[PDB]
């Protein structure tokens, strides 16, 4: 069980991947292969992956998952030591944790595990064993279970730079290449409208400022072309409106200046 | 030495580094740990740099240093190596290599390692020795050290896709806020010029064509703070125009009509 306990956790390790990137799925082979409780915590205490394995009743886990957040001094003291710890509980070989908070280790043979998945430090991987101690073939996995999570913290937060950052730019790259009419079109079309969606006249809103009628069509022959929306435009009843892009609404409100 | 000589490889781990990747040095910190030849061959079958110390007899590992590329059948053959099988010279075990292509292992005990990463094949990292074999603890350094060769492949090509994407795009954005007139200026500016570095008069250049100077004032005061050109705006006498952007006026050539 040195080459077989690392070959069922692999049937779960994903690199970015298509199916939902979720920590509430990441410790599947860390409960019956490590056979130990798994906590996946990020830098300053913010919870994205939880779940105790065995019913151990402490007074900082009976009120902790109740908040979904590490409190006051659980943001400045869970991010200091360069490496792991051997056999943590009410006893500690040295000053493992501050004398103000010796209570995170009262219920379990706990093991705070460092995530090093890119040449850095990604929060914590807090374990808490019932009776059995951490020895040989269930310690390397408690460490390996931190980087089976560490190909996904920069894959549930690095989808926050590829999709979230881009969507701003395109929703500007299309707006940039608009002449004044079409730029006054889409600004009056989506302000005098049903917040989210819309459906009204084809060109009765057109020349009530001074603009023309058919320049309204090509204004939409921009968004549809750059790549923002879908609209089954009827030549018999105005037109159809429903957004596709997720970040266009905000960059439409804050434009009154 | 399975965690002390690994801080000569995990500490070599320079994520993107910060300097335009050098590829022989990346093949030198695998030479001061396992102690062997290094051949960082990528996916298409090309070569980038080599750290060889001892003189070993070889046949097509020396037409791979001259050409830097394999002819005909190797790109097909070494495309079919899944993981890390240990020690294959003139004698393997199954149908791993053709007999006509078997001359890649003749002399010495060479152990080929694939560079798997991100969920795809990136190439073969070739290591060859003379009279020492890759033992029970000499090759997981080429397994954990094949997870990160692709790092500076998804950081070097990743600073030649975002680096290129941004270019051709910024090269276009500026083009946009240039009204047809303001464009006409650019079409005349670079066409009558010597080399990349060119400069001539303020009053003349304009109505020589017919255009005003006023729409070169603001026209070249767009690409200025946009991010395309630097030019010391001497209102006393014209100005000198050098580009901040490379493949930019190459977008001016093909877009004639």
Numbering used by the authors:
A (entry chain M), B (entry chain N): 2 to 258
In the authors' words:
CodY from B. subtilis consists of 259 amino acid residues.
For the unliganded form in particular, the tetramer is compact with extensive subunit interfaces.
